[PDB]
Design a protein around this ligand. Structure first.
Ligand SMILES: Nc1nc2c(ncn2[C@@H]2O[C@H](COP(=O)(O)OP(=O)(O)NP(=O)(O)O)[C@@H](O)[C@H]2O)c(=O)[nH]1
Ligand SMILES: [Mg+2]
Lengths: 532, 174
């Protein structure tokens, strides 16, 4: 009943899509043909530390500390030390996942100069993590989703460091292309500056009539006495919305972490000769009847088509006021292409000369091992171990958050569209079936995106393995290139702060295990603590 | 010293031709409604250089935007066509209220435009029949003292008859 009621709306908006997508590709292409990748330093930081624009990672000089800094370094490199160090802490009911999440990030921020080693430890931590969970008769499918322990949090990092190169020679494009497909399609219509809702909203939640299309001729601020720069816009955009439009059109090349913020800039309508007024988003000339503020717009200030404008150094409700599905298909159809492109190059073994990153294959070989190690013949099981490792952890993370990869500024509405795609992305990875708005739109696409994630896993399994020799070579490469990319002192000193908290249990276990005791590791530990 | 000035008045009364037939000493021709512009002219009055900056404004669709020209004004020049009694009445009702609202305590130099339409015979044809007569000096001069205008000055943007007299007083009143 509901399936025969949608294919009729898709057929009517079918033709509209072909002319909608086309007008975007031609516009977006030229807007980038003739990429702001966050450098490894920036990219990796925004992933290992959520919302941490602060230090200490890239940064102090201490005398009585550096002498003990080398101790904690060479001692942490000891395979067993780093294992007992984790097993003892995790065993305590002191710190929660929140702490298990930073420690996993600190260590990766320390052993980056020896990724060939930290990969050995990670495999050992992921081994036990699987053993403990299968020794307790836990349902296999429900293992890596979600306990988010210590090992898993390191694995999330492991992929971050290695899949950077892949976000360059391949994946980088369809993502930025998808982001610029949204950012440019929402602005196609009105965007309530107050509610965040938009005209062509992809999410049936942030979905918002009569509006016109004007086209201004801004005067490129970075230059002077040369050709102007036109910018297509609406007569409803806030003065703040437009200052964003112009800043995006004027600074097409230049990244965002360099553009003059929209707040530090004032819009000036250039008319006549030397006559120009500073139109503020909310000044003395503002409309309103009752106790309420009315955001100043174009029609409110009466803006004319082709008007000349310039950005100068700066010195409530908007629109809506509380078969409507036909519009949703318009957006779902127009962007239908941009997505299949990304979901294809995510589930692609060989793409544009670039093969599959060793990180993935090597890790998928690993899970197949542990799986064959426990006679787990159920394909559904190891299918869900893989999903809960790569796709649903690292990929879904940058689809919902593409500002971690790029030097961009995700606005309100754009985030409400990446979520709807990110949701469909998860569902396509899940082996389980399903029977509202989201599941209905891509109801006839989820089956297909699944077949891809299967073929994708199968192909990696058919491939020839990677020798423990070649992997140690590839890891050593990715370990030297970004060796001292981050102040290791800050990360190593931070870890030491924790070994002081539960120093008791730590020393008892470093003296319990015949391993850490045979190589008199407990002694090197005592020397490291006192000295510091 | 710079002296900011604004020229508010009804549509098609000769505010643009007034500010053009002065800054360029030439009178244009065809009429194109103004949205908002700005002119410049530096002259010496009684021995003192001034940076006069005339601010041509519109005249009812641009009422919700006009007020962006009043900020920091040192003198206003309310305008009305000497042959448009309709505009002469809007001096007390439309403009004087609005002007003194944003920039009160600032001088105001009322001005009667199209002085050349006074001593005309052809215009009278379309006036006598319309039962309306041109604005006389008295009727206007009283309107000036009524609205608290520092001075009443009539000129012709076309013939430049006493056109320079107007701006001379607008600076003398500041
Ligand atoms: N003969 C004559 N015509 C005049 C004089 N002043 C203005 N006009 C006429 O008045 C018409 C409108 O002039 P204009 O200055 O543009 O009026 P305005 O006050 O600018 N109108 P707006 O405010 O709507 O732009 C023109 O066609 C012009 O010929 C004047 O002193 N003499
Ligand atoms: Mg005018």
């Amino acid at each position: 009943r509901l399936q025969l009621q949608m294919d009729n709306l898709e057929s009517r908006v079918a033709l509209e899509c072909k002319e909608a997508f086309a007008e975007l590709q031609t516009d977006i292409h030229e807007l980038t043909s003739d990429i702001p990748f966050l450098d490894y330093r920036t990219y990796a930081m925004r992933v290992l530390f959520p919302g941490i624009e602060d230090h200490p990672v890239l940064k102090e000089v201490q005398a009585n500390v550096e002498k003990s800094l080398t101790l904690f370094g060479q001692l942490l490199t000891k395979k067993h030390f780093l294992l007992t160090f984790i097993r003892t802490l995790e065993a305590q009911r002191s710190f929660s996942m929140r702490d298990r999440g930073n420690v996993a990030s600190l260590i990766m921020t320390a052993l980056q100069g020896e990724m060939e080693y930290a990969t050995g430890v990670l495999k050992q931590l992921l081994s036990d993590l699987i053993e403990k969970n299968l020794e307790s008769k836990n349902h296999p499918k429900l293992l890596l989703r979600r306990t988010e322990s210590v090992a898993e949090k390191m694995l999330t990092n492991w992929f971050t460091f290695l899949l950077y190169k892949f976000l360059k020679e391949c994946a980088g494009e369809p993502l930025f292309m998808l982001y610029c497909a949204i950012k440019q399609q929402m602005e196609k219509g009105p965007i309530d500056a107050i509610t965040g809702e938009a005209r062509y909203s992809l999410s049936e939640d942030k979905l918002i009539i009569d509006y016109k299309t004007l086209t201004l001729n801004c005067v490129n601020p970075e230059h002077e006495n040369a050709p102007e720069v036109p910018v297509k816009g609406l007569n409803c955009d806030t003065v703040t919305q437009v200052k964003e439009k112009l800043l995006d059109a004027v600074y097409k090349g230049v990244p965002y972490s360099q553009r003059p913020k929209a707040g530090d800039m004032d819009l000036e309508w250039r008319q006549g000769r030397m006559a120009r007024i500073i139109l503020q988003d909310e000044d003395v000339t503002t409309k309103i009847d009752n106790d309420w503020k009315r955001l100043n717009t174009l029609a409110h200030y009466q803006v004319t088509d082709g008007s000349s404008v310039a950005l100068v150094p700066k010195q409530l409700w908007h629109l809506v006021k509380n078969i409507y599905l036909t519009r949703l298909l318009a957006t779902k159809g127009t962007l239908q292409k941009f997505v299949d492109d990304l979901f294809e190059t995510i589930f692609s073994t060989a793409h544009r000369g670039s093969a599959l990153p060793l990180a993935i294959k090597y890790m998928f070989d690993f899970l197949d091992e542990q799986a064959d190690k426990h006679q787990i013949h159920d394909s559904d099981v190891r299918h869900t171990w893989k999903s809960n490792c790569l796709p649903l952890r690292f990929w879904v993370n940058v689809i919902k958050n593409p500002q971690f990869v790029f030097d961009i500024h995700k606005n309100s509405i754009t985030d409400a569209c990446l979520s709807v795609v990110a949701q469909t992305f998860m569902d396509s990875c899940s082996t389980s079936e399903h029977k509202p708005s989201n599941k209905l739109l891509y109801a006839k696409d989820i089956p297909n995106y699944k077949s891809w994630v299967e073929r994708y896993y199968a192909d990696i399994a058919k491939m020839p393995a990677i020798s423990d020799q070649d992997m140690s070579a590839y890891l050593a490469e990715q370990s030297r290139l970004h060796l001292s990319q981050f102040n290791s002192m800050s990360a190593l000193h931070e870890i030491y702060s924790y070994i002081a908290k539960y120093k008791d249990e730590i020393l008892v276990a470093l003296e319990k295990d015949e391993q850490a005791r045979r190589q008199r590791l407990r002694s090197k530990l005592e020397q490291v603590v006192d000295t510091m | 010293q710079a002296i900011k000035c604004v020229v508010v008045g009804d549509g098609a009364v000769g505010k643009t031709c007034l500010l053009i037939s002065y800054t360029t000493n030439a009178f244009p021709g065809e009429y194109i409604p103004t949205v908002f512009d700005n002119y410049s002219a530096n002259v010496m009055v009684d021995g003192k250089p001034v940076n006069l900056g005339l601010w041509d404004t519109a005249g009812e669709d641009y009422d919700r935007l006009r007020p962006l020209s009043y900020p920091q004004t040192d003198v206003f020049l309310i305008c009305f066509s000497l042959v448009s009694p309709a505009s002469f009445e809007n001096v007390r009702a439309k403009w004087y209220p609005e002007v003194r609202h944003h920039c009160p305590n600032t001088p105001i130099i009322l001005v009667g435009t199209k002085l050349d339409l006074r001593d005309d015979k052809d215009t009278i044809e379309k006036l006598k029949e319309k039962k309306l007569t041109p604005i006389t000096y008295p009727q206007g001069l009283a309107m000036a003292k009524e609205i608290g205008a520092v001075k009443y000055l009539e000129c012709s943007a076309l013939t430049q008859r006493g056109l320079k007299t107007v701006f001379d007083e607008a600076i003398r009143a500041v």
